[PDB]
C-alpha cells in the first residue's frame, strides 16, 4: 500500500561543484532527498519543514541550497541526528500519531521493505537483506501503514553481511 520511485538530479561533476559553491539551484521536490558528499551518500527525510538526516554521513556540514549554504538548525552527535531548514519545494511529511508496529522502510533504491517494530528505536526485518541493499539508506524514513513518519533509519544489526534488524531514530525527538 506504500510505493516510491526515485529521480536523479545530478552526477559527480555537478555534485562536486555544488559542494564548493554551496548553491543548489535545481528544483527541489519529494519527501525524501538523496544526499551526497565527497566520501559518502545517504538520505534525508523532510518532517515539519525540516530535512532530517544522520550525523555519521552529514557531519556538521551545511546543505547547499538555492540562496546559498544552509546551516544545520539541529545537531546531535550522540543520537546521530541533524536537521536543516528544508528548502522550498520539499514535501514535508508528518509524524505517526497511531502506534502501529507494522512499519515500512524506504530505501536509497526507492524500495519499500516490511519492518516489525520491536523496541522504542528498534525493528526487525521480516525478510533478511544483504547489508549492501541497506547501505546508503541512512536517514531514510520508517513509515506507518498510512505513510506517516515513525522514525529515521540509523543503523542495522548484521551477521556475516546479512542484516536481520534495523535501528532508527524515533520521530518524537524531532
Amino acid at each position: 500500500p506504500i510505493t516510491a520511485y526515485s529521480q536523479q538530479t545530478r552526477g559527480l561533476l555537478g555534485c562536486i561543484i555544488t559542494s564548493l559553491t554551496g548553491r543548489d539551484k535545481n528544483q527541489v521536490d519529494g519527501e525524501v532527498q538523496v544526499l551526497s558528499t565527497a566520501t559518502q551518500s545517504f538520505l534525508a527525510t523532510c518532517v515539519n519543514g525540516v530535512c532530517w538526516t544522520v550525523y555519521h554521513g552529514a557531519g556538521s556540514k551545511t546543505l547547499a541550497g538555492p540562496k546559498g549554504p544552509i546551516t544545520q538548525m539541529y545537531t546531535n552527535v550522540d543520537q546521530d541526528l541533524v536537521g536543516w531548514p528544508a528548502p522550498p519545494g520539499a514535501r514535508s511529511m508528518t509524524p505517526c500519531t497511531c502506534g502501529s508496529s507494522d512499519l515500512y522502510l524506504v530505501t536509497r533504491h526507492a524500495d519499500v521493505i516490511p519492518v516489525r517494530r520491536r523496541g522504542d528505536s528498534r525493528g526487525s526485518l521480516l525478510s533478511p537483506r544483504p547489508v549492501s541493499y541497506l547501505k546508503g539508506s541512512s536517514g531514510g524514513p520508517l513509515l506507518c501503514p498510512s505513510g506517516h513518519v515513525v522514525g529515521i533509519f540509523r543503523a542495522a544489526v548484521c551477521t556475516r553481511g546479512v542484516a536481520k534488524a534495523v535501528d532508527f531514530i524515533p520521530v518524537e525527538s524531532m
Binding site: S6, Q7, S19, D24, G30, V32, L63, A64, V106
Partner: peptide, 12 residues
C-alpha cells in the same frame, strides 16, 4: 564542503 541533493524519492 556542503552536502548536496543528488536526487529525490517520491512517495505515495
Amino acid at each position: 564542503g556542503s552536502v548536496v541533493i543528488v536526487g529525490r524519492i517520491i512517495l505515495s
